Structure 1
């Protein structure tokens, strides 16, 4: 599953992140502290 994510270039990853986060939320609005936050919840 991760081999798709880890093999696509960022030029195609950006639209994927944009569609995952929905309209309005830019690809850069994500916070690193917030990022490690949801990483912590998903790791549980």
Structure 2
């Protein structure tokens, strides 16, 4: 599963992140502290 995520260039990853986060939320609005936060919840 992670093979596709790790094998795609950022030029195609950006639209994927944009569609995952929905409209309005830019690809850069994500916070690193917030990022490690949801990483912590998903790791549980």
Give the TM-score, by structure 2 length: 1.00
Extract structure 1 runs of 4+ deviating beyond 4 A: none
Count of aligned residue pairs for this structure pair: 44
Structure 1 residues 1-44: Cα deviation after superposition (integer angstroms, max 9, x where no partner) = 00000000000000000000000000000000000000000000
The structure where helix makes up a greater share of residues is 2
Give the TM-score, by structure 1 length: 1.00
Q: Which runs of 5+ in 1 are unaligned?
A: none
RMSD (Å) for aligned C-alpha atoms: 0.1
| Secondary structure of residue in 1 paired with 2:7 | coil
